[PDB]
Amino acid sequence: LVHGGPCDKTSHPYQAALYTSGHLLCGGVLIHPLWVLTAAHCKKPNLQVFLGKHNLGQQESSQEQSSVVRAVIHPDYDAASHDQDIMLLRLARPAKLSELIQPLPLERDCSAQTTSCHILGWGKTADGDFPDTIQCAYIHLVSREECEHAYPGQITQNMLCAGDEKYGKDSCQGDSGGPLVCGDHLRGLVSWGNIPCGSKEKPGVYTNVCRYTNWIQKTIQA
Ligand SMILES: CC[C@H](NC(=O)[C@H]1CN(c2ccc(C(=N)N)cc2)C(=O)O1)c1cccc2ccccc12
Numbered sequence: 001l002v003h004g005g006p007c008d009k010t011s012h013p014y015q016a017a018l019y020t021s022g023h024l025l026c027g028g029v030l031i032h033p034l035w036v037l038t039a040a041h042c043k044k045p046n047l048q049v050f051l052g053k054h055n056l057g058q059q060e061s062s063q064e065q066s067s068v069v070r071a072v073i074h075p076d077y078d079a080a081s082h083d084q085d086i087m088l089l090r091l092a093r094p095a096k097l098s099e100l101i102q103p104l105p106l107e108r109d110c111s112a113q114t115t116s117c118h119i120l121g122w123g124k125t126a127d128g129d130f131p132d133t134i135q136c137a138y139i140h141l142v143s144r145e146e147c148e149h150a151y152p153g154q155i156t157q158n159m160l161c162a163g164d165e166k167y168g169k170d171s172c173q174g175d176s177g178g179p180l181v182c183g184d185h186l187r188g189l190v191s192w193g194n195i196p197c198g199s200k201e202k203p204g205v206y207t208n209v210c211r212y213t214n215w216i217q218k219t220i221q222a
Pocket of ligand 1: 024025026041042170171172173174175176190191192193194195196197198203204205
């Protein structure tokens with residue numbers, strides 16, 4: 001993510017890091033002791049999930065590593081447009097919850113009022129580097145009308161736009177599937193946006209999690 005800074009160490013207990021081949025692939029969000037949400041475009045074989053991490057270069061006493069034993073991409077995901085860019089990952093065992101490992105409640109209300117949000121991740125920064133320490137930035141949800149204006153004809157009801165007019169804080173490569181948190185609820189997932197990253201003119205685009213309540217429930221209860 002670009003134009004942010006290191007997160008407070010205790011402020012992100014729901015953040016997951018998704019690895020394959022020993023390297024960071026995506027972010028993710030713990031939503032249940034057995035389940036992490038990420039972007040559909042993150043699907044690959046041999047996925048490992050790290051919970052409780054802050055610095056990727058350290059073996060942290062709070063961390064837990066787990067294999068993904070089932071990956072359930074949304075059946076209607078459209079790779080070209082990123083429509084329905086959501087996937088549920090079932091962990092090999094219930095997450096060992098702690099002060100630093102906690103699920104984040106979902107925003108189920110698609111009419112929810114709160115537009116002050118934040119994003120987090122270990123993706124690319126404004127200098128091009130990939131940080132060991134998780135980065136955070138405050139950004140704002142934009143109205144559906146302003147979102148449609150930024151990407152004419154390319155915004156569906158399954159997408160939200162958010163960004164920052166002052167500094168252009170924005171998510172980036174490596175942050176996919178990370179949470180857009182608004183009013184301390186999960187509102188969206190990092191999906192797509194401008195390259196180079198930066199939201200001063202075109203906002204980042206996020207999967208609208210409130211549209212997936214029923215699919216999430218059916219998947220978890222199957
Ligand atoms: C799963 C592969 C991974 N895909 C992505 O990160 C996606 C997400 N995204 C992207 C671009 C701009 C914004 C924005 N809000 N402005 C948000 C997301 C993008 O372009 O692709 C990836 C792509 C390229 C380099 C990487 C390096 C390390 C780890 C993952 C990398």
